[PDB]
């Protein structure tokens, strides 16, 4: 009980993305009553968000701190056995954690009579198969049970009915990583770092077009300007900064207009994003936002289980409209259709994966509407990314007129004479892009 009070006073809140305090979660698991007096502890290591890999890093760097928190939680809530769910496609992490548990049970930490006490705790490693939808917080329960990875409605919440109908505590690994400091040094150390709403530090895995890539231990509330410029080293090759995507495909995109915004739980959800898995991807001017919106929507489209009709059907209806915009066949009036689809899917999804599916489109429509209008109306791609919308034009002052691109053209759209610049028929070629790559002088440009 004192451990629960200390954790609650520490202000520790789950960094998985939902922002629920772990103290309340532990209390609601402790006060529950089971039929046979058996309680469990289960843990999530199934990272699925692209561009984020701290969950495997903490296992492959220090699994002892991971497994000590296991016994801390088990003693706090009275659970006698625990489970771990780690992806099998990370052989080094699995081998390191199994060697760690073997050493711990050899020393006598795990098993019976832990440190000559009355608490006995045992661990069994469950080998997941690496499914994003299985990373969901009831789909993991079903996967461990041996059924399909289809999520269950809540309530009954997993704090009251978990493994085999018994109360169980569920938290991510990097949240457990900070409890040794809480126990050894006190709650005030965690309370002294960060803002009032959120305390402590957080792991950020950054990537994209950035000079230096990797992981950062940033204090709670650090602004994005400090992360991108002071630590990240700035935009490489002197390109123009457009935005940084936070929270992965389930999060959002922050442009330069809010670069000074404090990063926290409340500010992000007020800005249309959230923490997600903790991954940040910074991008420069060469990007077309329609294409990345389509990609972030396709990622969730390919991972939908198909149980509830919204996340199964509406995601594909949204993918089709973005595909037709990208192909240049789109017409006017698609903006309000996207708005209606997003608001409909947002409020009527059983699973949390389908709730945040239209979130990147919502973030992009509110900030970069001019790109959508240019794609729909002007039929022009500013970044030269949309294959069917850009035009290949040669530079007559630089082009030698050798004719190499003419022979490499598969649709027979390039014509001209020797020593003279050629001509490109846009309506003939399918804009494959082989002519620009086959040019040795680089005289072909995309408009």
């Amino acid at each position: 009980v004192d451990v629960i009070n200390e954790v609650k006073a520490s202000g520790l809140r789950g960094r998985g993305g939902g922002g629920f305090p772990t103290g309340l979660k532990w209390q609601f698991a402790h006060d529950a009553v089971s039929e046979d007096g058996i309680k469990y502890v289960a843990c999530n290591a199934d990272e699925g968000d692209p561009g984020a890999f701290m969950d495997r890093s903490v296992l492959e760097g220090d699994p002892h701190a991971v497994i000590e928190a296991m016994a801390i939680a088990g003693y706090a809530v009275g659970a006698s056995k625990g489970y771990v769910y780690v992806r099998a496609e990370y052989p080094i992490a699995v081998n390191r954690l199994q060697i760690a548990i073997d050493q711990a049970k050899e020393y006598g930490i795990l098993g019976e009579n832990i440190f000559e006490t009355d608490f006995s705790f045992d661990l069994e490693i469950r080998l997941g198969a690496g499914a994003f939808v299985c990373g969901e917080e009831t789909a993991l329960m079903n996967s461990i049970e041996g059924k399909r990875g289809e999520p269950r409605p809540r309530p009954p919440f997993p704090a009251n009915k978990g493994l085999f109908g018994k109360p169980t505590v569920l938290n991510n690994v990097e949240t457990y990583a900070n409890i040794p400091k809480i126990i050894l040094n006190g709650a005030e150390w965690f309370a002294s770092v960060g803002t009032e709403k959120s305390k402590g530090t957080k792991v950020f895995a950054l990537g994209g077009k950035i000079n230096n890539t990797g992981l950062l231990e940033i204090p709670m509330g650090t602004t994005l300007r400090e992360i991108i410029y002071e630590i990240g080293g700035g935009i490489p090759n002197g390109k123009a900064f457009k935005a940084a995507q936070t929270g992965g495909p389930s999060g959002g995109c922050l442009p330069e207009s809010l670069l000074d915004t404090e990063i926290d739980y409340d500010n992000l959800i007020a800005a249309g994003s959230m923490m997600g898995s903790g991954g940040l991807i910074v991008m420069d001017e060469d990007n077309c936002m329609v294409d990345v919106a389509r990609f972030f929507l396709d990622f969730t489209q390919d991972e939908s289980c198909g149980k509830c009709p919204p996340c199964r059907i509406g995601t594909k209806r949204m993918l089709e409209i973005l595909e037709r915009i990208c192909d240049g066949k789109g017409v006017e009036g698609d903006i309000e259709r996207l708005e209606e689809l997003a608001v409909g899917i947002k409020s009527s999804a059983l699973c949390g994966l389908g709730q945040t599916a239209p979130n990147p489109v919502l973030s992009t429509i509110r900030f970069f509407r001019d790109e959508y209008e240019a794609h729909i109306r002007d039929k022009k791609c500013p970044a030269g990314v949309c294959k069917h919308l850009l035009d290949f034009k040669i530079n007559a002052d630089t082009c030698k007129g050798c004719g190499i691109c003419a022979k490499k053209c598969p649709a027979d759209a390039i014509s001209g004479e020797k020593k003279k610049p050629y001509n490109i028929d846009t309506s003939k070629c399918i804009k494959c892009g082989a002519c620009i790559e086959a040019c040795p002088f680089g005289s072909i440009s995309k408009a």
Binding site: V133, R148, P153, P155, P156, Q301, D302, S304, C305, G306, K307, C308, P309, P310, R312, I313, G314, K316, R317, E320, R337, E340, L341, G344, K346, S347, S348, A349, L350, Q355
Partner: protein, 583 residues
């Protein structure tokens, strides 16, 4: 028992723990749209259509699978709820095939009713639908994949009730479907053709095979004589299709309607029912007096005989050798009636009207042939009969009452009570007690086994030297349980076992008209149909016993000599063999 107090929309009331808000709203005069929810069968929360706003909640919650807690505040008609329901319906309707004029279910489809109620004005969302695959290869069950909405009711009906489990879910996303294993058809998997999945589908992707064209072609042949026979349970549920109230018998109107289609002869199956009762009593006595293979089990319903031939073959010796009443009547009309009236047996067609879809498979069996000729040629269900009435278009509400045709139209109460569960047992016990000890039994006291519904145990002392032990079971799970109990050696002292596949008897068969969850949550349909059958039984003022029928005694004293005679063994008996399963 913990008592939970709660308020719904401003009405406070007491429930046991675990009561969903939907039940409380329905029993307190509030209705909420529903597609995937069935009582004690399907509570998964998959359709996402009964969303109800809850104060203080993040988003709309599903009502059907929401346990209620103390002191909540609920609103059901905020504009957000209506907009969400309309958007969800327009999303579900974007993949459905929308040819309602050419859809077999049509007038009683749940999706059409919900689309009409909520007012779906326009469909904005177009695209490409999931592929179409019509499985028009089986004998009794047909699937159209373009009409499925993935509500998953059929899976739970086939897995939890029938305990057969030949249906599952494959894939993820738009590639997800409901399918049998091996990517095969139902005719290649161990299905038993019960038909429950057909009557428990909410849109009409599952249908029965249509043999109406064969009947129409058979009638149009001037050189063929056509004889139709009627089941005892079809007249306890047919009126429901013509607007008649719940549980009304339409015997006279049925006879008039059948006579108006053009059938040459119209007969009732109760003659074969009484014949079967006499033969089964005779084998009872023969096996008891000679120490045969016991306990005896019936051979009436094709569903569980296919279940035996597929799953449990070592019990084929335990089976009775007598044919089903339909086959008995068909063979008797093919031989004795043909000899009497000088009509060529190969120039006759016999059609039966039964509430089953497995009878279509029973007709296809080659072993049920007499002198190289099939007993019954064409079999149809009750729904096809009603559709034939509507297409011939005779006003079923104003027919005058009529009677069946002699001599095969005579009926007795012991042969009428077959439809509900426990009727065959009652009739057999009555006849055997009257024959052996002159004991006048009228009703049988049934003891229900604690914890299990569907299994009935009793013990009737027919003679001081012979107490007849009785077992009755209906439903796939109950059949499986009693088979496990028999194979474990716990059924050594039993004498009779009756097994029906469909739950509640043939009054709840797969050929009966489909009733949605609306009327299904109001009145117990099996109980009321059994009540109608028993009420018709209690008003038979001519004869209430099987051996007292003049027609059967005349037949036995003119043609069949004595029960279990060599002629009876040659004509009315058949053998069974095991069948391969591919699951």
């Amino acid at each position: 028992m913990k008592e939970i107090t709660f308020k719904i929309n401003g009405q406070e009331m007491i429930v046991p723990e675990g009561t969903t808000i939907l039940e409380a709203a329905r029993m307190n005069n509030i209705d909420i749209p529903t597609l995937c929810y069935l009582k004690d069968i399907n509570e998964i929360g998959a359709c996402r259509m009964c969303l109800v706003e809850i104060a203080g909640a993040r988003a709309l919650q599903a009502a059907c699978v929401y346990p209620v807690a103390n002191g909540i505040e609920v609103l059901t008609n905020s504009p957000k709820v209506r907009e969400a329901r309309r958007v969800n319906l327009e999303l579900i309707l974007s993949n459905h095939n929308r040819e309602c004029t050419t859809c077999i279910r049509s007038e009683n489809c749940e999706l059409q009713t919900l689309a009409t109620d909520l007012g779906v004005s326009d469909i904005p969302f177009e695209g490409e639908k999931s592929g179409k695959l019509i499985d028009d290869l089986s004998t009794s069950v047909v699937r159209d994949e373009s009409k499925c909405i993935l509500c998953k009711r059929c899976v739970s009906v086939c897995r939890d009730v029938q305990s057969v489990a030949v249906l599952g879910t494959v894939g993820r996303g738009f590639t997800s479907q409901v399918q049998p294993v091996f990517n095969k058809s139902l005719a290649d998997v161990g299905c038993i053709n019960c038909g429950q999945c057909i009557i428990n589908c909410p849109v009409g992707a599952l249908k029965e095979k249509s043999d109406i064209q064969r009947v129409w072609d058979a009638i149009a042949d001037p050189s063929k004589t056509v004889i139709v026979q009627t089941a005892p349970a079809v007249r306890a549920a047919l009126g429901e299709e013509f607007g008649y109230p719940m549980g009304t018998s339409v015997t006279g109107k049925m006879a008039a309607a059948l006579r108006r289609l053009g059938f040459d002869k119209v007969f009732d199956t109760d003659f074969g029912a009484d014949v079967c009762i006499m033969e089964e009593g005779t084998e009872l006595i023969g096996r008891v007096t000679n120490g045969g293979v016991l306990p005896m089990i019936t051979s009436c319903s094709p569903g569980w005989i296919k279940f035996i031939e597929t799953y449990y073959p070592e019990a084929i010796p335990h089976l009775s050798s007598c044919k089903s009443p339909q086959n008995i009547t068909g063979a008797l009309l093919k031989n004795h009636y043909a000899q009497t009236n000088n009509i060529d047996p190969k120039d006759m067609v016999v059609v039966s009207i039964m509430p089953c879809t497995a009878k279509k498979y029973e007709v296809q069996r080659e072993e049920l042939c007499t002198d190289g000729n099939a007993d019954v040629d064409i079999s149809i269900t009750t729904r096809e009969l009603a559709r034939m009435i509507k297409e011939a278009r005779i006003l079923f509400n104003k027919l005058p009452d009529e009677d069946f045709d002699d001599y095969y139209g005579e009926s007795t109460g012991a042969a009428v009570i077959f439809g509900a569960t426990g009727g065959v047992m009652e009739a057999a016990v009555r006849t055997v007690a009257d024959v052996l000890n002159k004991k006048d039994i009228q009703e049988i006291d049934y003891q229900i086994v604690r914890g299990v519904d569907g299994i009935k145990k009793a013990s009737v002392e027919v003679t001081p030297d012979l107490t007849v032990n009785l077992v009755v079971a209906h439903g796939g799970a109950n059949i499986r349980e009693v088979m496990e109990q028999l194979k474990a050696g716990e059924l050594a002292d039993t004498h009779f076992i009756e097994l029906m596949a469909c739950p509640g008897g043939c009054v709840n068969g797969g050929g009966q008209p489909i009733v949605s969850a609306k009327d299904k949550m109001d009145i117990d349909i099996r109980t009321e149909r059994a009540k109608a059958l028993y009420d018709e039984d209690a008003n038979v003022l001519t004869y209430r016993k099987s051996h007292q029928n003049p027609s059967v005694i005349r037949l036995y004293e003119e043609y069949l000599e004595e029960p279990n005679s060599p002629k009876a063994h040659h004509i009315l008996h058949t053998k069974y063999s095991a069948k391969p399963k591919l699951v």
